[PDB]
Each structure stands twice: as C-alpha cells, then as structure tokens.
Design a protein around this ligand. Structure first.
Ligand code: BR
Length: 181
C-alpha cells in the first residue's frame, strides 16, 4: 500500500497509502481547512484543555452546545457536530482515551458516508489522555491501511495529522519512514 515519504511544502511530510495522500505537519489545527476536523476530547465531550480548548474556543458556543446536547442523549463513542467558526463542514469529536485505531476507523467511515474528501486530525490521545506518541502514530496509520485494504477509500483522498508538538511530529515521521516502499 505504501508510497514514498516526501516533503511537498515546508514542514509537511506526505506519502501515499493506497489512493489516500497521508500528511503530517506541526502547528495549530484550528487554522486548517478540511471537510472534517477531528477533536480529541473526553467522554463528556466538554474538555477544554490543550488542543480541545483551541478547537472549542475557535468553533464557538453553538458547537459546545451541540456537544453537550448529544452527550445528554445517549452513550456515544464519538459525536459529530457542525464546524462552527472552524473551516470545516463537520467536527468529529472522539474520545482521546479510547482505542485510537477504532476512533480513526470511525472517522474514515463517517467521512465516506458524507462523500467527504479531506480530513484533518490531531495526534489523538497524546494530550489529556496521555497515550504514548509512538503507539498513537502506529494506530492512526494502521487505521488508514485497514480502510484502504478493505476497499473502503472512495471519497476520502487526503488525511492530514496536524500535531501540536514538533517532537510528536518527529515520531510520526519516523513511523512513515518505517512503512515507506
Ligand atoms: Br496534537
């Protein structure tokens, strides 16, 4: 499945995984444009610390309210809200403590269901949940491999991880180089 790691733009690394362009970069995810932006939050969908703070503050109070409304309704493994004032069509709020491969698989499936092309996510779990960056990287990329292997990638064309700490970026880079053709 794996293509070659290159750097298309300063500080960005990319490689193909099947038909998907997988990219990683460091920086502030709230500045990104994508069909879906992922928020890594708590099981109450109301964390406002680290990247979740930035996402909820930029997205706005209407998204905060959509989150607590759905959180009240049933036990969710993740929730989908509007994008608020972020540059996306939907935010998918996943639980940072949850199995990362499972969370990314869910995000990919939801994006196919909406015929979306682009996804931007953080290094899910490496914030408040304190999952280890190496395991998180392995899980994210494994989820994308499985999705491609199953023939499920149709609308999804671009998956970008925008990562708050350059040191975590370095871990993702190493993982891509491990996998490259
Ligand atoms: Br991150």
């Amino acid at each position: 499945f794996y293509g070659t790691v290159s750097s298309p733009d300063s500080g960005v690394y990319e490689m193909k995984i099947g038909s998907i362009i997988f990219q990683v970069a460091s920086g502030d995810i709230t500045k990104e444009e994508a069909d879906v932006i992922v928020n890594s939050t708590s099981n109450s969908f109301n964390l406002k610390a680290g990247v979740s703070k930035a996402i909820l503050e930029c997205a706005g109070q209407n998204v905060e309210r959509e989150c607590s409304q759905q959180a009240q309704q049933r036990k969710n493994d993740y929730i989908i809200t509007g994008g608020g004032f972020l540059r996306c069509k939907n935010i998918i709020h996943v639980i940072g403590g949850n199995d990362v491969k499972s969370s990314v698989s869910s995000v990919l499936q939801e994006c196919e269901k909406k015929n979306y092309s682009s996804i931007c996510l953080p290094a899910i779990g490496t914030g408040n949940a304190k999952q280890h960056p190496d395991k998180v990287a392995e899980a994210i990329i494994d989820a994308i491999e499985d999705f491609v292997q199953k023939g499920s990638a149709q609308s999804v064309k671009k998956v970008k991880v925008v990562i708050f700490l350059p040191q975590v970026l370095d871990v993702f880079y190493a993982n891509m180089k491990k996998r490259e053709g």
